[PDB]
Scaffold this active site. Structure first.
Site, PDB file in Angstrom:
ATOM      1  CE1 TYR A 290      12.728   3.009   2.697  1.00  0.00           C
ATOM      2  CE2 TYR A 290      12.725   1.791   4.915  1.00  0.00           C
ATOM      3  CZ  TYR A 290      12.426   2.122   3.919  1.00  0.00           C
ATOM      4  OH  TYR A 290      11.416   1.587   3.105  1.00  0.00           O
TER       5      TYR A 290
ATOM      6  CE  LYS B 225      -0.845   6.933  12.831  1.00  0.00           C
ATOM      7  NZ  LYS B 225      -2.020   7.177  12.375  1.00  0.00           N
TER       8      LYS B 225
ATOM      9  CG  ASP C 286      -3.616   5.959   9.233  1.00  0.00           C
ATOM     10  OD1 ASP C 286      -2.492   7.041   9.452  1.00  0.00           O
ATOM     11  OD2 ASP C 286      -5.036   6.696   9.944  1.00  0.00           O
TER      12      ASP C 286
ATOM     13  CG  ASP D  95      10.143   2.297  -0.268  1.00  0.00           C
ATOM     14  OD1 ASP D  95      11.833   1.623   0.296  1.00  0.00           O
ATOM     15  OD2 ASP D  95      10.843   2.725  -1.620  1.00  0.00           O
TER      16      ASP D  95
ATOM     17  CG  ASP E 169       6.869   0.700  -4.052  1.00  0.00           C
ATOM     18  OD1 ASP E 169       7.347   1.874  -5.356  1.00  0.00           O
ATOM     19  OD2 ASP E 169       7.551   0.026  -3.271  1.00  0.00           O
TER      20      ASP E 169
END
Lengths: 345, 345
Positions: free
Chosen positions: B139, B185, B217, B241, B245
């Site tokens: 970001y 990851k 994942d 993020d 959520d």
């Protein structure tokens, strides 16, 4: 239709034959002109030829119009040099055919809502197909590196990479409910805006398919809250990897999932489950994923959508009538297949 | 304890007062030496001072030990230049205090499993806290750009950015069930391996907390399949993020969620819900998130874990006894608060 069959390891041979029993049945009833040949692949190939994707098999895949793949790998070949491992052979297959899109469907068959981790009211009617870009993104992007002080990776996408994956999502959607949702992170990332921009432009050539855009974080929430409202979802490599895994848990059983990889060359259809060596030769292995892979093949490799749907309805009924062991039943591989065939008339 | 109260817009004043009624009650019974002052913030501040985060408020936040924030924003200030919008004021607040970690809990209170999109068997017992890194990652990473041919963004992390967010996850965990799961990851990305490496090293100083690593994942699947097995989860900006959520939808109601942001300066505690102007001044607004934010404050800003848990148990009971409108009840803001207080003895 010329099909190259690569049964593979473990339960591969058993589940692959069950799918062929269904294909041959359809061939008799519809005259599909089915022509297939089985080639050695994976572990069986290492033990016989010293490599998991031997030359005759490479040629066979090139000669075919589709590849029906079984299971690959096992503890027996886990301790081998990467270059010759079963898993590596799968990579070689995908690369040789330049397959750039991974189709990953998640469906909750009527009557099987109980198996979903979601309440039955929301699990009902789920039938989403995730299209994931396979060759680009952060997994392959450069620059990339690591030092004692920091590490970096690049999420990069060129227009042609986005255009091609987007086109298969639209073609796939045409065969379904004609609705696509492209997932990105446009409100924050440049690649997100680039992706959205390109998919909206590509969509102009497909007036018969509705296009919608969604943010990845929001999509994660929708898949758990209202997964039944989607049809086709198209997104990048890492986002597709996450979203397809999330969608995977919806039906409540990995054994039921088929998968496909489309691209420039011969398309590949394979069940998502592993080889499960421990039960090889006992019967009992659930052929649902292999049969559903055969259905995916008819739909995407030959456009026989009407037939694919017929096979799908048959297995749906078979799951309720003669549930396989993994679903709290006693129907072995052959028993289950017999029921499927019974409904294919 | 010096607390700076920023009620904000819409239902902000109402829900914030309800939390203060709880804090004052605890202050009387325990002698917390509660000292607070309310400052103008957000829309109310724009209309009164021309900017959403005026000077007196900036000083007030610096002078305080914690900030109890209400709701901010509304249609009335949506059409203003970015520099002075309510949302921007929130950004300024976070930046001024160098808050780098966002605490985002998702809990399924006993008896409220029915509200979860998950089956009651799996929704039961969920109490996960996602710690998300706020200042770094893709970001904000560079290089980043876009052209007619391609677009790129960089997921970059330096050791100190990972070390600091990791430390708060460990400290937070100590106050809970002492178990942290770091999500990355690593099997594919350099930053993933760098992240894992650093968090394992940092963990050495916290022998009383169990550390576990998970792939993003895979974590997505676990949150829908067995969310009850986690306590604290720590991860990067984009991953946090998405995961926060996803975890948000588990309890089945956004109105129940509190949130916190920790860092170098004065910590900020605020409800996740918006201002809901349409119902301002009617009573009816559910103060659960504001009261739970007050509880988060006691726990993380003052270490009063025992008291935070007491407040939490009280609201749990209040939700079952006198359910607010949004939960199919008729208990307005005051009625609900009265029940909470009733159980705080």
């Amino acid at each position: 239709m010329k099909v190259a069959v690569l049964p593979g390891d473990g339960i591969g041979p058993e589940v692959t034959e069950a799918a062929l029993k269904v294909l041959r049945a359809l061939d008799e009833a519809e005259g599909l002109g089915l022509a297939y040949e089985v080639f050695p692949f994976g572990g069986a190939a290492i033990d016989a030829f010293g490599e998991p994707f031997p030359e005759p098999t490479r040629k066979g895949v090139e000669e075919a119009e589709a590849v029906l793949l079984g299971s690959v790998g096992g503890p027996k070949w886990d301790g081998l040099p990467r270059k010759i491992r079963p898993e590596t052979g799968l990579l070689s297959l995908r690369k040789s055919q330049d397959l750039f899109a991974n189709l990953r469907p998640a469906k909750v068959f009527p009557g099987l809502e109980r198996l979903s981790p979601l309440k039955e009211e929301i699990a009902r009617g789920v039938d989403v197909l995730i299209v994931r870009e396979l060759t680009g993104g952060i997994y392959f992007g450069e620059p990339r590196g690591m030092s004692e002080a920091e590490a970096w990776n690049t999420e990069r996408y060129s227009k042609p990479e986005v255009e091609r994956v987007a086109r298969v999502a639209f073609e796939v959607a045409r065969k379904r409910r004609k609705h696509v949702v492209s997932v990105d992170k446009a409100n924050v990332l440049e690649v997100g805006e680039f992706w959205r921009k390109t998919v909206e432009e590509v969509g102009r050539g497909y007036p018969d398919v509705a296009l919608e855009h969604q943010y990845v974080d929001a999509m994660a929430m929708h898949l758990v809250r209202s997964p039944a409202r989607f049809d086709v979802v198209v997104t990048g490599n890492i986002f597709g990897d996450i979203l397809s895994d999330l969608a995977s848990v919806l039906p409540g059983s990995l054994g039921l999932l088929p998968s496909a990889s489309l691209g420039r060359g011969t398309p590949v259809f394979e069940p998502v489950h592993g080889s499960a060596p421990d039960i090889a030769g006992k019967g009992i292995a659930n052929p649902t994923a292999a049969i559903l892979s055969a259905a995916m093949m008819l739909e995407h490799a030959f456009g026989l959508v009407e037939l694919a749907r017929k096979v799908e309805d048959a297995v749906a009924k078979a799951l309720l009538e003669t549930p396989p062991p993994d679903l709290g039943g006693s129907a072995g591989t052959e028993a289950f297949t017999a029921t499927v065939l019974r409904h294919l008339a």
